[PDB]
Amino acid sequence: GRQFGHLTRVRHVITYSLSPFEQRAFPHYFSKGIPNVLRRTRACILRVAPPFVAFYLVYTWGTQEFEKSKRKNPA
Template identity: 70%
Template sequence: MHWRKLRHISPGSLKERSDRRFDAIAAEFLRKSAPDSRMGRHFGDLARVRHIITYSLSPFEQRAFANYFSKGIPNVWRRFTSSVFRVAPPMVAMYLTYTWGNQVHEQGKRKDPKQFENDE
């Protein structure tokens, strides 16, 4: 809707003012009634950060799966094999300790049959 069409809903005092003044008031009205200004600031514009330059590439220029099979899968395998020998031994040791502790706990909860030989 063009702002000049708002003239019929403006108060009578606006009709008496010059067109230039009405143009400024109508432009201010449209600026304030825009959806962006009514609801506050958008999430990405909550704070103004100065002296930091960011660069980004348009999503239309990106290739999501570029070199996925030729470089991606070998890279995952290389990273896995380089760290598995640092991560796996402590995890195996902790698992064995945990299962041993549970086994000892279950054995400790058992009743001794010798204590109940003379019961009726």
């Protein structure tokens, strides 16, 4: 296990931070938030959805074909 002070070499980086008591918890919750979720849905719908839509079709057809297989019109 490593601790702080022994992790890595970092040079010339300034970090400005604010106290949680000086700043609001939800700055622009819906105004900045809603655009962001839509943006990262858009960024991933082409990788996440096409296997599930493919399963949905293989599920919808499979269930249909299972029902209409036992029944028969001629003797």
